[PDB]
Amino acid sequence: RWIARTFFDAPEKNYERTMAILQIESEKAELRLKELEVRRLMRAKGDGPWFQYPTIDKALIDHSPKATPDN
Amino acid sequence: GWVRPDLGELSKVTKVKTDRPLPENPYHSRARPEPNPEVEGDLKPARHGSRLFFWTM
Numbered sequence: 001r002w003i004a005r006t007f008f009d010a011p012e013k014n015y016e017r018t019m020a021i022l023q024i025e026s027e028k029a030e031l032r033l034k035e036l037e038v039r040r041l042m043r044a045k046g047d048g049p050w051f052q053y054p055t056i057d058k059a060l061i062d063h064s065p066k067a068t069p070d071n
Numbered sequence: 072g073w074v075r076p077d078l079g080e081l082s083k084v085t086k087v088k089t090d091r092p093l094p095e096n097p098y099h100s101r102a103r104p105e106p107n108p109e110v111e112g113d114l115k116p117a118r119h120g121s122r123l124f125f126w127t128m
Contacts, residue, residue: 028119028127035122049110 042048120128 024119024127028122031118031122047108049107052107 038048039050043051046052120126
């Protein structure tokens with residue numbers, strides 16, 4: 001009884017530690033699988049803000065009266 | 072009559088009134104396909120740090 005009193009831990013302490021720790025890592029695993037599914041559909045269709053390789057910037061396209069009428 | 076135009080008075084960009092209307096889309100092209108949904112708003116600290124193999128927070 002003295003050994004359990006001065007050194008060891010209650011099963012309540014360890015049990016709730018296990019339960020909280022499973023909650024944490026279940027969040028981690030669900031976010032990881034959701035991450036890779038979001039990544040594969042976002043590479044497939046391209047609608048998302050990740051895989052957008054830079055196209056032409058149209059600010060340099062400056063329409064104006066040219067020399068030749070038929071451009 | 073017919074006064075000769077001074078150098079360089081065949082210049083000097085000119086107004087004129089018309090009768091036909093000014094046109095929309097003179098480049099006979101389609102409409103613009105899609106805008107990109109803009110990501111805005113504030114950002115929270117990340118969910119459990121890295122979510123790599125380990126190195127949690």
